[PDB]
Amino acid sequence: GAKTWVLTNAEEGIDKGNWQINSDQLKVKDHAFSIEQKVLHGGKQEGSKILTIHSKDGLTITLSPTRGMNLLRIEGFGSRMGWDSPVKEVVNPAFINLESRNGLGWLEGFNEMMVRCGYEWTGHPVTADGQIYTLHGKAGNTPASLVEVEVADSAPYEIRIRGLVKESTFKKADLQTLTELRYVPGSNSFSLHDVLTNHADYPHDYQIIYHSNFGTPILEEGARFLAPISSISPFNDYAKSGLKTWQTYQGPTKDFDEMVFNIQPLADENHQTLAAVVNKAGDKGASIQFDTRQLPVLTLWKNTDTVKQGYVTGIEPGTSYAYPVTIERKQKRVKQLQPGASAQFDLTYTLLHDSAQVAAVEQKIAKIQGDNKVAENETPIAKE
Amino acid sequence: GAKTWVLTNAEEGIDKGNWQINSDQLKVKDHAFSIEQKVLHGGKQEGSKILTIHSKDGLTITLSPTRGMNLLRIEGFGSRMGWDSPVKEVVNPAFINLESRNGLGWLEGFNEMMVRCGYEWTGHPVTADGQIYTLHGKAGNTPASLVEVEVADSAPYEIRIRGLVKESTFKKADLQTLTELRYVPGSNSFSLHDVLTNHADYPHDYQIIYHSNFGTPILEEGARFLAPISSISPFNDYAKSGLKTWQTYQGPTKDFDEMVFNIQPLADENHQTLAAVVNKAGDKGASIQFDTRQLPVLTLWKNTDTVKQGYVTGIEPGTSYAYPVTIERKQKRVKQLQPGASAQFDLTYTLLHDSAQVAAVEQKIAKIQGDNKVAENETPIAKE
Amino acid sequence: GAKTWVLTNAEEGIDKGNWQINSDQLKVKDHAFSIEQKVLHGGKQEGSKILTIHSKDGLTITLSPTRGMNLLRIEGFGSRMGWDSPVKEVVNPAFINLESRNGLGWLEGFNEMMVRCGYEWTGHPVTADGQIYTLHGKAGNTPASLVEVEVADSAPYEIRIRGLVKESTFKKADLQTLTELRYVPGSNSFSLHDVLTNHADYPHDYQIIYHSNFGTPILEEGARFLAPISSISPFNDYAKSGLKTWQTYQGPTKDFDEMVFNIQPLADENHQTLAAVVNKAGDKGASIQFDTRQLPVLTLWKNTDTVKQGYVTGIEPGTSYAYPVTIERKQKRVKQLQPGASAQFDLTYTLLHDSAQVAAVEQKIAKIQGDNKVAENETPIAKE
Ligand SMILES: [Cl-]
Ligand SMILES: [Cl-]
Ligand SMILES: [Cl-]
Ligand SMILES: [Cl-]
Ligand SMILES: [Cl-]
Ligand SMILES: [Cl-]
Ligand SMILES: [Cl-]
């Protein structure tokens, strides 16, 4: 079957803190691994936890239960999924005021490979309904209430890490997400299987962007963005000049800031699509597979500014674009979950570590693109 | 005589954390009990403390020193005082931003049987001056600075639990409340004897509502609210339809939200009054005794919505109604405390667990009411 | 040689918590001392740290690594640098919302002898752009990321305490200050040698006020403020009446609140200046040496209100006056720090404990003032 360890359970008032298991204790001499929770200290990181899967000749996956089960970084195969933010600390949400800087205090903690920007709302901040809707919602700055590590009894010893992140407020909402990361030791991919449940007796809105962020050694001058798309448009007027070269990345560029593109992806016959970033040579990359019934739109964030400012790209499948909640409501992208109902989010991330792997991804994308022409539309779909 | 244990003393920088005493080890020979402080973990409850008096044959009383000595739950005699909020965690105030949601962040922590909504201000939020007065003030989200447990050395072994909750701000205020709960082991009642003191050299405003909340098994369709009153009026236009049936509760009702009523209570010759919620059969209930010189007004919060949304009633004696501080100042209910002066708050809460007990409460209330007519006034006293 | 202890290093995820060293363990000859870090508990002080140098027959210096290495108090020679705020706790910044009270939340934590009011911004609050610039910035409410204690192994055994306080925000800033206090056992002075560094690739504004605060036994009726100045002016209309007796303090006075004065100091042949507060008899005082190229302006805060409200004076060298950032920008005092560049802050604090030490400071100040006339300007330089 499987062994489960409950690391954190708020209903029983318990948290194991520092903890580790390893493949020697389970008596398995195949692809060695360990799973470890560490309580961090110093600065604004005081009391933050990280949980890591260390796989011999596979991926090392670091996530933070304190920060909504956000993925900090993925390393392996001479590469990584991650970037180098000026924010070096794993910031305890107790030291972040999301309302500060007119709804941009979230920037004080942003350094992750994957942040769930949701679920009660998402996107750029706005003052509306008499309140501040803060940048990218609350999931990424909510400590998990339940954290469980499961390891399969039988080969290939799949690891599942679940974390329940709650957005429970009297008179407002009771949205809770059971996040799950799955990883087979030695594999070059992992998957997320997240389930958002509306525990209230009333329907409630939700939004989510799987904000996935990649820097060197995949991002570089001449790196490319690959996706099957029916249309692409600039987020704002500043991005218009980058529309023609949407598929190619510049090297680290002073005064660039960012250019964002809103994409309507194409999917295969079973609603699966794939997006990727690959290096100039075409021998390193990262791909994200997602289901367009769950996540119908895609944001491309090209943050090719200096290495210290942040040299990174975001491939961001979502229910929404990053416009503020007022625009996402007006344009009918905000979703609704019936009382007691659940929404699933299935994503597969692959660290592409040779030319053949990049070629296969590029071939699949071409097959989905087929003879459909990419419509490059210069007019932004909204103005904030 | 009595023995005192000092669980928390910020002046000496100490906090015992996990701690317990019990009647066995104390060689107490009559009603068995234990008193336990527990440090909680998980989710937004990380570091939060609860302090519980466990009784074999009496009341089990849980309070939270992290959350201003608010009373979380009272259980005994086949019943309870409390309710089931969507907020299941004992939220550490470090994870609440009271200014968020336009001064409604307090909703993210609300699950208690008794919240002190005060003392520097209280009531619904409003932006006045250039500042946000947040929902129900700060006492309830302030960790106690001094916590002591006292047990009398001989029968009946009265237990007292004291907690100093400070609202100290340079240039603004130095209001401090020494909260105190008293419980005789085996009893069906407990009392509060709080003392607010103005430690500043200037008079300062204060407001307080003892926001006392009762759900199932007391609250149900056909449950009744009992009180001796001179007048009652709806809080807003929406409550006008419920005024004629103010004394009777509906079952859990979808789309109800809440109806609030503002009451001017009658008192006996010693300025004591009594209010209660009783079930339909009249064999379970809870009564609150309060002093109308200390708490001159009463708010009835009828939140008979769905069980998941909140099926609960508040019996809320206060110096103020729940309108914002702007309305409470305008209508002259904001009290002032002179330099060095103190204000006392004496309340007795009784868990009524048979017909005779409910009948006795109903008879005392009928005696205080006497021949005074209840004025049901249709016009709200203020508009927010 | 020298011995170093790393008490806190966020990069490695470590913090020593409770820790001590003493001069018996280090085999020191003629002067006994200890350095101790203590983790505090209770109220809003839970988890806050203090770090103290105890020197027998010298100064006892207490600072807080949790609160940006702010100096809490200095004690020795029958006197002290410090004051008695109504805020008695060492408030963990997790429990302060700087945006509360319209940007005055900082007031809930203010009790320190020296607060670094900076560095991203400083001064009184203002809502500009779209954003709240909160009172006196963020350094004083930021836990240190790296904390090091260094002690020289031979006479006179100088102690150095370094604390890295970061203001790192994606897309906004990456200002980091390596604070440093130096102290020689047995001495009546200590020094600060801080270094602010812009770790970003873009120039950034900065401001700093070294908010140094003194009460009894130095401050009293007829206490004097000494400084070599070219001009002094009041902060606002209310401070006009105190302009002529700027050098003289009143006793604790009801309804005074405060009077603030904006000074232009003179300096010596190496750009050094000296400001001091001395008692009426002139046998106790405190002086601050600073570099006028580093901190070109000086603020005198006379808060001679009651002992309970706050009987304190601030000698406040800085790059800016306490006006909001809008005024400081407009009147051209906001400094710019270039990419990779550093700014230094060298200050010497001396606890004056006899008539001749006060004599010397007043005569050293005498030499600096010379034949230059003090221009008392009745017009405030700005209106907030
Ligand atoms: Cl377990
Ligand atoms: Cl539109
Ligand atoms: Cl290859
Ligand atoms: Cl004790
Ligand atoms: Cl209305
Ligand atoms: Cl009965
Ligand atoms: Cl800015």
XYZ file of N, CA, C and O in Angstrom, chain B residues 121-235:
460
model
N -11.821 51.072 21.292
C -13.057 51.293 20.526
C -13.721 49.953 20.265
O -13.142 48.904 20.557
N -14.918 50.001 19.687
C -15.683 48.811 19.367
C -16.592 49.062 18.164
O -16.645 50.151 17.615
N -17.287 48.016 17.740
C -18.336 48.153 16.750
C -17.899 47.961 15.314
O -16.714 47.714 15.028
N -18.857 48.109 14.407
C -18.581 47.946 12.978
C -17.507 48.949 12.534
O -17.377 50.016 13.120
N -16.740 48.613 11.486
C -15.655 49.492 11.057
C -16.084 50.792 10.371
O -17.205 50.900 9.893
N -15.192 51.775 10.401
C -15.393 53.061 9.733
C -14.054 53.695 9.611
O -13.197 53.499 10.481
N -13.852 54.437 8.526
C -12.672 55.277 8.355
C -13.079 56.688 8.790
O -13.942 57.278 8.196
N -12.469 57.191 9.849
C -12.749 58.528 10.408
C -11.402 59.031 10.843
O -10.514 58.229 11.116
N -11.268 60.360 10.845
C -9.982 61.073 10.804
C -9.483 60.591 9.455
O -10.252 60.513 8.492
N -8.220 60.211 9.390
C -7.767 59.485 8.228
C -7.511 58.025 8.578
O -6.766 57.362 7.868
N -8.137 57.484 9.632
C -7.724 56.143 10.102
C -8.843 55.127 10.074
O -10.011 55.474 10.204
N -8.465 53.861 9.970
C -9.457 52.789 9.960
C -9.664 52.319 11.386
O -8.737 51.836 12.011
N -10.885 52.447 11.880
C -11.291 51.842 13.131
C -11.805 50.485 12.758
O -12.847 50.380 12.142
N -11.068 49.451 13.134
C -11.344 48.096 12.704
C -12.417 47.434 13.567
O -12.620 47.810 14.716
N -13.089 46.445 12.981
C -14.204 45.757 13.603
C -13.909 45.270 15.025
O -13.059 44.384 15.246
N -14.640 45.817 15.973
C -14.634 45.339 17.372
C -13.352 45.512 18.150
O -13.128 44.812 19.144
N -12.536 46.472 17.751
C -11.372 46.832 18.525
C -10.275 45.786 18.554
O -10.194 44.870 17.675
N -9.422 45.921 19.556
C -8.172 45.132 19.616
C -8.013 44.133 20.733
O -7.135 43.265 20.610
N -8.830 44.204 21.792
C -8.612 43.349 22.980
C -8.621 41.888 22.602
O -7.755 41.096 23.031
N -9.591 41.522 21.785
C -9.747 40.137 21.373
C -8.615 39.537 20.537
O -8.513 38.298 20.422
N -7.803 40.393 19.917
C -6.640 39.959 19.139
C -5.319 40.423 19.746
O -4.336 40.567 19.049
N -5.300 40.604 21.072
C -4.109 41.012 21.808
C -3.702 39.885 22.764
O -4.488 39.504 23.602
N -2.472 39.362 22.632
C -1.946 38.376 23.569
C -1.762 38.942 24.969
O -1.252 40.047 25.134
N -2.202 38.187 25.973
C -2.114 38.641 27.341
C -0.641 38.799 27.763
O 0.214 37.996 27.411
N -0.372 39.825 28.561
C 0.962 40.132 29.040
C 1.257 39.450 30.362
O 2.401 39.232 30.696
N 0.218 39.194 31.136
C 0.341 38.557 32.464
C -0.818 37.584 32.562
O -1.944 37.979 32.325
N -0.530 36.329 32.881
C -1.545 35.312 33.047
C -1.234 34.573 34.347
O -0.101 34.078 34.516
N -2.226 34.531 35.254
C -2.136 33.830 36.546
C -3.337 32.934 36.755
O -4.459 33.298 36.375
N -3.081 31.787 37.377
C -4.102 30.833 37.766
C -4.048 30.718 39.297
O -2.978 30.503 39.884
N -5.204 30.814 39.929
C -5.298 30.768 41.393
C -6.319 29.700 41.770
O -7.376 29.597 41.138
N -6.001 28.925 42.795
C -6.917 27.909 43.331
C -6.942 28.074 44.840
O -5.890 28.081 45.484
N -8.131 28.276 45.387
C -8.308 28.385 46.836
C -7.803 27.125 47.527
O -7.920 26.011 46.988
N -7.249 27.308 48.719
C -6.640 26.181 49.452
C -7.618 25.269 50.180
O -7.194 24.247 50.746
N -8.909 25.617 50.196
C -9.904 24.771 50.863
C -11.225 24.847 50.117
O -11.389 25.706 49.252
N -12.121 23.918 50.421
C -13.430 23.830 49.793
C -14.133 25.178 49.848
O -14.097 25.833 50.888
N -14.803 25.579 48.758
C -15.086 24.885 47.504
C -14.044 25.022 46.405
O -14.356 24.718 45.257
N -12.797 25.404 46.723
C -11.711 25.364 45.709
C -11.960 26.221 44.486
O -11.718 25.817 43.349
N -12.433 27.444 44.735
C -12.665 28.391 43.676
C -11.369 28.635 42.874
O -10.324 28.848 43.440
N -11.514 28.619 41.550
C -10.454 28.830 40.602
C -10.646 30.232 40.031
O -11.760 30.608 39.702
N -9.556 30.989 39.926
C -9.581 32.264 39.258
C -8.487 32.292 38.220
O -7.351 31.883 38.494
N -8.827 32.780 37.047
C -7.875 32.882 35.957
C -7.850 34.339 35.537
O -8.859 34.876 35.047
N -6.694 34.966 35.721
C -6.509 36.388 35.395
C -5.588 36.547 34.201
O -4.630 35.802 34.058
N -5.892 37.538 33.360
C -5.084 37.881 32.201
C -5.077 39.369 31.912
O -6.140 39.932 31.675
N -3.894 39.992 31.937
C -3.736 41.436 31.657
C -3.560 41.624 30.148
O -2.598 41.119 29.575
N -4.487 42.338 29.528
C -4.516 42.619 28.087
C -4.317 44.120 27.906
O -5.109 44.945 28.379
N -3.227 44.488 27.261
C -2.808 45.874 27.190
C -3.055 46.506 25.842
O -2.854 45.867 24.799
N -3.469 47.772 25.871
C -3.672 48.589 24.682
C -2.877 49.877 24.961
O -3.470 50.894 25.294
N -1.546 49.752 24.860
C -0.528 50.770 25.159
C 0.119 51.259 23.878
O 0.717 50.466 23.138
N -0.010 52.557 23.602
C 0.517 53.152 22.380
C 1.055 54.514 22.711
O 0.315 55.328 23.260
N 2.334 54.759 22.429
C 2.927 56.089 22.701
C 2.135 57.191 21.994
O 1.740 57.032 20.860
N 1.853 58.276 22.715
C 1.085 59.436 22.238
C -0.402 59.199 22.087
O -1.117 60.121 21.746
N -0.912 58.010 22.368
C -2.310 57.716 22.036
C -3.156 57.231 23.210
O -4.227 57.790 23.496
N -2.666 56.211 23.892
C -3.441 55.556 24.955
C -2.596 54.627 25.819
O -1.523 54.174 25.412
N -3.049 54.411 27.048
C -2.498 53.344 27.884
C -3.652 52.772 28.691
O -3.816 53.018 29.901
N -4.500 52.057 27.972
C -5.624 51.360 28.543
C -5.202 49.918 28.750
O -4.592 49.306 27.854
N -5.497 49.373 29.929
C -5.159 47.991 30.228
C -6.306 47.350 31.006
O -6.817 47.941 31.944
N -6.661 46.128 30.642
C -7.744 45.405 31.286
C -7.240 44.151 31.963
O -6.663 43.295 31.299
N -7.407 44.078 33.283
C -7.092 42.866 34.022
C -8.364 42.067 33.969
O -9.312 42.336 34.718
N -8.402 41.091 33.057
C -9.554 40.203 32.929
C -9.507 39.153 34.035
O -8.410 38.765 34.485
N -10.679 38.700 34.495
C -10.719 37.622 35.497
C -11.971 36.787 35.338
O -13.088 37.327 35.287
N -11.766 35.485 35.215
C -12.836 34.492 35.235
C -12.746 33.704 36.544
O -11.648 33.324 36.964
N -13.893 33.491 37.190
C -13.971 32.754 38.452
C -14.922 31.582 38.275
O -16.020 31.723 37.717
N -14.497 30.413 38.727
C -15.307 29.210 38.589
C -15.149 28.325 39.813
O -14.031 28.029 40.203
N -16.274 27.928 40.423
C -16.283 26.990 41.519
C -16.476 25.578 40.912
O -17.471 25.298 40.238
N -15.510 24.674 41.147
C -15.629 23.326 40.605
C -16.961 22.669 40.881
O -17.467 22.762 41.981
N -17.561 22.064 39.862
C -18.900 21.451 40.007
C -20.103 22.363 39.743
O -21.225 21.881 39.581
N -19.870 23.665 39.696
C -20.916 24.649 39.471
C -21.367 24.644 38.011
O -20.599 24.272 37.103
N -22.574 25.144 37.768
C -23.050 25.365 36.401
C -22.900 26.847 35.986
O -23.437 27.237 34.960
N -22.232 27.674 36.796
C -22.005 29.048 36.429
C -20.552 29.445 36.572
O -19.784 28.803 37.291
N -20.177 30.510 35.871
C -18.862 31.129 36.047
C -19.099 32.632 36.008
O -20.150 33.063 35.571
N -18.140 33.414 36.496
C -18.315 34.859 36.480
C -17.065 35.518 35.933
O -15.976 34.944 35.988
N -17.255 36.708 35.367
C -16.181 37.577 34.935
C -16.196 38.791 35.854
O -17.263 39.315 36.159
N -15.010 39.247 36.229
C -14.780 40.437 37.021
C -13.594 41.135 36.425
O -12.488 41.042 36.931
N -13.824 41.788 35.291
C -12.781 42.489 34.586
C -12.657 43.900 35.152
O -13.660 44.492 35.593
N -11.442 44.445 35.107
C -11.177 45.813 35.524
C -10.340 46.523 34.445
O -9.199 46.163 34.201
N -10.938 47.502 33.782
C -10.248 48.347 32.809
C -9.645 49.501 33.599
O -10.358 50.124 34.421
N -8.368 49.780 33.378
C -7.706 50.920 34.005
C -7.026 51.797 32.969
O -6.355 51.315 32.045
N -7.219 53.106 33.129
C -6.543 54.084 32.289
C -5.251 54.460 33.000
O -5.271 55.176 33.998
N -4.132 53.938 32.499
C -2.816 54.211 33.099
C -2.192 55.505 32.607
O -1.097 55.849 33.036
N -2.869 56.223 31.715
C -2.340 57.461 31.149
C -2.626 58.630 32.082
O -3.366 58.493 33.052
N -2.058 59.787 31.770
C -2.287 61.008 32.532
C -3.415 61.875 31.968
O -3.671 62.951 32.503
N -4.080 61.409 30.909
C -5.158 62.151 30.244
C -6.391 61.283 30.159
O -6.275 60.058 30.055
N -7.583 61.901 30.201
C -8.776 61.087 30.033
C -8.765 60.444 28.666
O -8.295 61.069 27.721
N -9.258 59.207 28.574
C -9.360 58.529 27.302
C -10.732 57.894 27.132
O -11.348 57.397 28.099
N -11.222 57.936 25.901
C -12.451 57.227 25.530
C -12.298 55.705 25.674
O -11.197 55.189 25.574
N -13.402 55.018 25.953
C -13.424 53.569 25.885
C -14.819 53.134 25.506
O -15.776 53.886 25.690
N -14.886 51.953 24.908
C -16.118 51.257 24.586
C -15.914 49.762 24.799
O -14.819 49.260 24.560
N -16.965 49.045 25.185
C -16.863 47.567 25.303
C -18.193 46.891 25.045
O -19.205 47.358 25.507
N -18.163 45.763 24.320
C -19.306 44.896 24.156
C -18.795 43.502 24.559
O -17.747 43.055 24.035
N -19.494 42.841 25.494
C -19.231 41.455 25.878
C -20.043 40.576 24.919
O -21.214 40.245 25.165
N -19.416 40.227 23.805
C -20.071 39.624 22.665
C -20.184 38.126 22.933
O -19.239 37.365 22.703
N -21.338 37.712 23.440
C -21.525 36.350 23.973
C -22.392 35.541 23.021
O -23.531 35.940 22.723
N -21.892 34.383 22.576
C -22.419 33.694 21.398
C -22.844 32.270 21.678
O -22.060 31.484 22.208
N -24.080 31.932 21.302
C -24.691 30.645 21.681
C -25.296 30.022 20.434
O -26.040 30.679 19.715
N -24.928 28.773 20.160
C -25.473 28.035 19.015
C -26.171 26.804 19.554
O -26.677 26.796 20.719
N -26.210 25.756 18.737
C -26.805 24.491 19.173
C -26.004 23.932 20.373
O -24.811 24.189 20.472
N -26.636 23.155 21.270
C -28.019 22.670 21.322
C -29.030 23.603 21.953
O -30.193 23.218 22.088
N -28.612 24.789 22.393
C -29.556 25.760 22.981
C -30.377 26.413 21.890
O -31.601 26.430 21.952
N -29.694 26.936 20.875
C -30.344 27.605 19.753
C -30.913 26.538 18.838
O -30.268 25.530 18.577
N -32.151 26.765 18.428
C -32.924 25.908 17.544
C -34.197 26.675 17.192
O -34.476 27.730 17.771
N -34.920 26.171 16.208
C -36.256 26.666 15.880
C -37.120 26.627 17.146
O -37.210 25.590 17.807
N -37.742 27.754 17.477
C -38.627 27.832 18.634
C -37.887 28.159 19.922
O -38.504 28.273 20.976
N -36.571 28.329 19.855
C -35.819 28.824 21.019
C -36.277 30.240 21.233
O -36.805 30.882 20.303
N -36.025 30.743 22.433
C -36.528 32.039 22.843
C -35.430 32.886 23.460
O -34.505 32.351 24.088
N -35.529 34.195 23.246
C -34.667 35.170 23.885
C -35.493 35.815 24.972
O -36.589 36.322 24.702
N -34.965 35.801 26.196
C -35.664 36.340 27.360
C -34.885 37.531 27.911
O -33.687 37.457 28.121
N -35.565 38.637 28.187
C -34.916 39.780 28.844
C -35.975 40.769 29.293
O -36.998 40.844 28.628
N -35.742 41.492 30.410
C -36.618 42.552 30.888
C -36.176 43.820 30.171
O -35.024 44.222 30.309
N -37.086 44.421 29.407
C -36.705 45.543 28.560
C -37.741 46.659 28.524
O -38.950 46.428 28.622
N -37.220 47.878 28.417
C -38.089 49.051 28.260
C -38.339 49.309 26.775
O -39.474 49.639 26.399
N -37.326 49.144 25.921
C -37.545 49.319 24.481
C -36.656 48.451 23.633
O -35.623 47.972 24.086
N -37.109 48.190 22.416
C -36.325 47.419 21.433
C -36.636 47.968 20.057
O -37.819 48.277 19.741
N -35.571 48.110 19.264
C -35.646 48.619 17.902
C -34.700 47.894 16.968
O -33.650 47.373 17.396
N -35.072 47.800 15.688
C -34.176 47.094 14.788
C -32.934 47.919 14.503
O -33.015 49.144 14.466
N -31.799 47.232 14.293
C -30.508 47.874 13.994
C -30.515 48.625 12.649
O -29.895 49.688 12.526
